[PDB]
Design a protein around this nucleic acid. Structure first.
Ligand SMILES: [Mg+2]
Ligand SMILES: [Mg+2]
Ligand SMILES: [Mg+2]
Ligand SMILES: [Mg+2]
Ligand SMILES: [Mg+2]
Ligand SMILES: [Mg+2]
Ligand SMILES: [Mg+2]
Ligand SMILES: [Mg+2]
Ligand SMILES: [Mg+2]
Ligand SMILES: [Mg+2]
Ligand SMILES: [Mg+2]
Ligand SMILES: [Mg+2]
Ligand SMILES: [Mg+2]
Ligand SMILES: [Mg+2]
Ligand SMILES: [Mg+2]
Ligand SMILES: [Mg+2]
Ligand SMILES: [Mg+2]
Ligand SMILES: [Mg+2]
Ligand SMILES: [Mg+2]
Ligand SMILES: [Mg+2]
Ligand SMILES: [Mg+2]
Ligand SMILES: [Mg+2]
Ligand SMILES: [Mg+2]
Ligand SMILES: [Mg+2]
Ligand SMILES: [Mg+2]
Ligand SMILES: [Mg+2]
Ligand SMILES: [Mg+2]
Ligand SMILES: [Mg+2]
Ligand SMILES: [Mg+2]
Ligand SMILES: [Mg+2]
Ligand SMILES: [Mg+2]
Ligand SMILES: [Mg+2]
Ligand SMILES: [Mg+2]
Ligand SMILES: [Mg+2]
Lengths: 147, 53, 66, 125, 186
RNA sequence: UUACCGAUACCAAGCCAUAAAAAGAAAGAAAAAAUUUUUUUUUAGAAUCUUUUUAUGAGUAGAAAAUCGUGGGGUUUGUGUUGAAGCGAAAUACGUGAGUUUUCGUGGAACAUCUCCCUAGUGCAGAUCUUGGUGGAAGUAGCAACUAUUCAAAU
RNA sequence: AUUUCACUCAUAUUAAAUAAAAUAACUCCAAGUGGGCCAUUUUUGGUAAGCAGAACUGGCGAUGAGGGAUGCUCCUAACG
RNA sequence: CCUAUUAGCUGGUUAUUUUCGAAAGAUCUCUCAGGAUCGCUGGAGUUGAUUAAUAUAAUUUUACCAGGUAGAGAUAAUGA
RNA sequence: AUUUUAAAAUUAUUUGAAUUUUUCUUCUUAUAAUUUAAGUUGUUUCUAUACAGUACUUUCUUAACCCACUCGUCUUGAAACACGGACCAAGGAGUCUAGCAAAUGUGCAAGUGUAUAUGAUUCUUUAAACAUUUUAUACGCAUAAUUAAUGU
RNA sequence: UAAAGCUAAAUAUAUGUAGGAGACCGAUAGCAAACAAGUACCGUGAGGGAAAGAUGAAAUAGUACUCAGGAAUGAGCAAUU
């Protein structure tokens, strides 16, 4: 809203806040990203260090749907269950839950965190990591591969 | 350029004003579309306007 | 036309406007590249000390709560 | 100079007129602050126009009182002057400029019955 | 004249008043200013100050860290001047008593199912006038992402600051100035 | 060797603003005039608020807050043939100030909102600025090529 | 080296004096500047210059008041 | 007509009071009438102090350290 | 509306001790008053036994005494023998859109944002407002990094 | 499953014509043009291109008569409102 703009405070002043000696002129240093590597070098180097040059191989026709893969850690793995359902399994001891994470939108199980001690759980997925699968085995569970 | 800002990228270098389009009548057009596909139903006289897929 | 080429007139008035600042006086500094074969041994000493301390504390907890 | 009547003190009575408004007729007398190098009024040369400052301010205890030693309240009809029945010694009334004679007679007659003074009870007679 | 610094005038630096126009928050500020003044307890002063701070200095606190901080303070009351959020990484929750400004629905439900209670600040002002057996806590104030761009500029030796980039990949700012193979690293 | 004159600097006192400070969220009768009854004045409690105390005040380029005014919109509540807006001259008027407010005259049909909000083609002394109108110069420069005019009468 | 236990080292006059010493310390977002000149003392080139070039401090610029008849930079002294 | 082409260059850039307050050095630059970067300034915010303390200081004192300018010398070295 | 109080001083009666031996000699060791404490009080006269007068308030005009170079601009430096300005009225210059960030206010929170559409006993206003498909996989940003890369 | 062919809907519309509307402009503004406006006028030609709205309710009330003056016009005891 034009009511609150800064320029209205300079309305009786001569130079509109831009200076007697250095004016407000039009493009006194170039246009856009003009002078990089010549007279804008310091800015480019201290704020965007790796900007110039190229590195790596080409990939000519990508097709990103071939490698799409969302992940989930073992922490959030008991939290997919309702709390009253989580209560029942921790009470009884000869039953365990079987969870299929692909039905929830995850493809690869990943292994950060701590599973509950002596509480078996069976997990279905497309890919597993080594540490995640070890942690699932240690508490008495099992991993299953699906496609 | 002079500050810790991202490097500018905007693709406005041709005569971009000649083709700008503001959408003032989106709800008007859906009213029209609804009325047309409702008129078809009374012309069918009972049979539906959908097909099995 | 020529011009000036050097002076440091007015430079220590600007220097004293916000005073002469000083270092920070921390308690520890990083031993990244300093004398090795001495700090690796220190790592072993501290691991042994921590093991003893934790074992005593854990044993005290175990008997206290019974 | 300083003017003092009772306990009310005015620190100045003359106005502040705009610099160079006596010499050019396109310049109006309303005060504007001078900006611009080499002015002689912005730089406080002796012998020229003075600038207004916060020092000339008035005592907080006597800041809006008239020579009547009361505050002024402006009314537009008979009903607007209802609140003045509780504080009839600290306020005086003035009638608005665009009320007719018939309305003015009623306002004056009620103000008399309330024991409140009217500043301009002689207009449009 | 006379040789003072800042013409003898003392300087202060923080926030002085509320910016928010919420009437209930203004009632709370009035109440706790009165309590701080008439019972100077160093508990009411800090509270009266904290509920004026801007949003970035009232961070959320999760349930797991709340329980961890109160592990050795049974039958005490925790006081927070932010919001409490749920944590799906916890398996079980204890019985706790907590006062704060806001609770999320899931956290509020989980707390009450374990036998605890939630309080507002006008209830803690009524039952604990001087904050007896109350523990003040706050969440992380430097975990926001904006803070990862502050500090030494990215380009000085050994700086941890993130840069501002269009996107992320091998083609976006990784060649000259980031590896020894192109003229220098960092 | 003495006396004296002389600053916006020094000292004592009042007032304005700025900065900090000591306090405040539970309420009750004072005087005068008249003869043991009448009559006047007051009888307070708005938190970016109300009392009281101390120190301080130069400013180009530049930065911020508070405040004043203009064309339209929503809400509230208002003026006008017993004369609106506009314009001319003013005021024992208010404000440090930009400005509000009122009187008399002319005028002949519309005009506000400060209760709080929204919005913009929103504030001029200059740019050899744009369009229109008007001056001093001034009753002045000037009304000089081409040989040349006169007497009487009509209208 | 580090770690754990014992004992003990002036304070109220503060491990020497003085201090409108916290008007401190640290982060963030930005403006305007990047043609300067003058005076005492030191000092380079030049016969010298109201010439050209440096050092420390104070100023003019950005600043008015009293004095120097007059005067951007001298003396007193800085502004409700 | 493209076209209100482009100008590191001249000219202009509209209400009040109150508070704070500069730079004319430095590095790089087909750079020397320009620009980016540091320094100088404003505004926000937190952490502290409010305990005549501690942090602190363009100042002294006590203990210790480093120097080759003024002066001197030419019968001590070098050169006159 | 209860610190213009307490205390202190003074004056006149007192209860006791000193010493400087006294019509201002000391020590509030008992009651009353007063101010020198605890920021000005009193008496006469005038305006006047008035209703706007020649008096009082106020606004203009014209003298005196002291003082006062032409504004705006570039500039180390402007009253300048530096440039623009004969006068008056109206007009006249940091805005709009995209994209990013910081600050602040608001809502919800490991999630958040109902896209394009569709629905409705929505249809002057309404081009607004209301709704979401009758153990629930549209898409964006976030929840995990790193490497040229197979990948992990 | 190339080197032959046809085909509606969902899409676009600074043109022409008709209808409705707005937190738009208010006669130096808004289209160049609120009026005999692409008109008057300028250029050999291609082309250039303005200024200019308002009496009153009613003129089916627009000023009758007298005096002065060649007239224009002025004055009135005379006249519409
Ligand atoms: Mg300025
Ligand atoms: Mg300029
Ligand atoms: Mg320059
Ligand atoms: Mg005045
Ligand atoms: Mg100057
Ligand atoms: Mg002073
Ligand atoms: Mg000032
Ligand atoms: Mg407009
Ligand atoms: Mg008006
Ligand atoms: Mg009419
Ligand atoms: Mg304009
Ligand atoms: Mg003008
Ligand atoms: Mg002549
Ligand atoms: Mg000076
Ligand atoms: Mg002289
Ligand atoms: Mg051009
Ligand atoms: Mg200052
Ligand atoms: Mg220049
Ligand atoms: Mg040395
Ligand atoms: Mg020598
Ligand atoms: Mg004189
Ligand atoms: Mg003179
Ligand atoms: Mg300058
Ligand atoms: Mg020059
Ligand atoms: Mg000048
Ligand atoms: Mg000259
Ligand atoms: Mg020039
Ligand atoms: Mg000229
Ligand atoms: Mg104008
Ligand atoms: Mg934000
Ligand atoms: Mg075919
Ligand atoms: Mg075809
Ligand atoms: Mg229309
Ligand atoms: Mg026109």
């Amino acid at each position: 809203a034009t009511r609150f703009k800064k320029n209205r405070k300079k309305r009786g002043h001569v130079s509109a806040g831009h200076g007697r000696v250095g004016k407000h002129r039009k493009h006194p240093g170039g246009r856009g990203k003009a002078g990089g590597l010549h007279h804008m070098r310091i800015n480019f180097d201290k704020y965007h260090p790796g900007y110039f040059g190229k590195v790596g191989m080409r990939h000519l026709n990508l097709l990103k749907n071939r490698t799409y893969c969302p992940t989930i850690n073992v922490d959030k793995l008991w939290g997919l269950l309702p709390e009253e359902k989580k209560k029942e399994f921790s009470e009884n001891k000869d039953i365990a839950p079987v969870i299929d994470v692909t039905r929830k939108g995850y493809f690869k199980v990943l292994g950060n965190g701590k599973l509950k001690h002596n509480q078996p759980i069976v997990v279905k997925a497309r890919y597993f990591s080594s540490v995640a699968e070890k942690k699932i085995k240690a508490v008495g569970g099992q991993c299953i591969l699906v496609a | 350029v002079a500050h810790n800002n991202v490097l500018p990228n905007v693709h406005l270098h041709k005569w971009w004003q000649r083709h700008v389009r503001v959408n003032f009548s989106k709800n008007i057009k859906k009213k029209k579309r609804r009325l047309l596909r409702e008129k078809r139903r009374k012309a069918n006289g009972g049979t539906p306007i959908e097909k099995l897929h | 036309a020529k011009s000036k080429n050097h002076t440091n007139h007015n430079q220590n008035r600007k220097a004293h406007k916000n005073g002469i600042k000083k270092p920070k006086k921390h308690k520890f500094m990083s031993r990244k590249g300093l004398d090795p074969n001495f700090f690796r041994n220190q790592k072993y000493c501290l691991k042994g000390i921590q093991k003893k301390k934790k074992e005593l504390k854990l044993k005290a907890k175990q008997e206290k709560n019974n | 100079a300083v003017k003092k009547v009772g306990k009310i003190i005015k620190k100045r009575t003359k106005k502040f007129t705009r610099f160079q408004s006596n010499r050019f007729m396109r310049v109006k007398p309303a005060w504007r602050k001078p900006r611009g190098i080499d002015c002689r009024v912005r730089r406080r040369y002796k012998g020229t126009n003075l600038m207004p400052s916060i020092g000339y301010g008035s005592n907080k205890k006597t800041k809006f009182l008239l020579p009547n030693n009361k505050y002024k309240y402006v009314v537009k009809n008979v009903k607007e002057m209802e609140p003045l029945i509780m504080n009839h010694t600290k306020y005086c009334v003035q009638i608005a400029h665009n009320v007719s004679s018939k309305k003015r007679k009623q306002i004056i007659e009620r103000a008399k019955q309330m024991n409140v003074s009217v500043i301009n009870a002689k207009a449009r007679l | 004249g006379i040789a003072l610094k800042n013409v003898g005038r003392i300087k202060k630096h923080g926030r002085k008043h509320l910016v928010s126009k919420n009437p209930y928050l203004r009632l709370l500020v009035k109440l706790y200013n009165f309590l701080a003044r008439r019972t100077n307890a160093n508990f009411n002063k800090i509270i009266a100050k904290r509920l004026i701070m801007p949003k970035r200095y009232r961070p959320p606190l999760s349930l797991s860290k709340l329980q961890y901080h109160m592990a050795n303070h049974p039958n005490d009351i925790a006081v927070v001047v932010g919001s409490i959020t749920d944590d799906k990484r916890l398996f079980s929750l204890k019985q706790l008593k907590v006062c704060a400004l806001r609770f999320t629905e899931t956290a509020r439900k989980r707390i009450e199912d374990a036998g605890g209670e939630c309080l507002t600040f006008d209830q803690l002002a009524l039952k604990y006038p001087t904050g007896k057996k109350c523990v003040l806590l706050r969440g992380p104030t430097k975990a926001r992402t904006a803070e990862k761009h502050f500090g030494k500029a990215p380009g000085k030796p050994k700086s941890k600051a993130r840069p501002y980039v269009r996107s992320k990949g091998r083609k976006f700012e990784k060649a000259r100035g980031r590896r020894k193979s192109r003229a220098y690293k960092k």
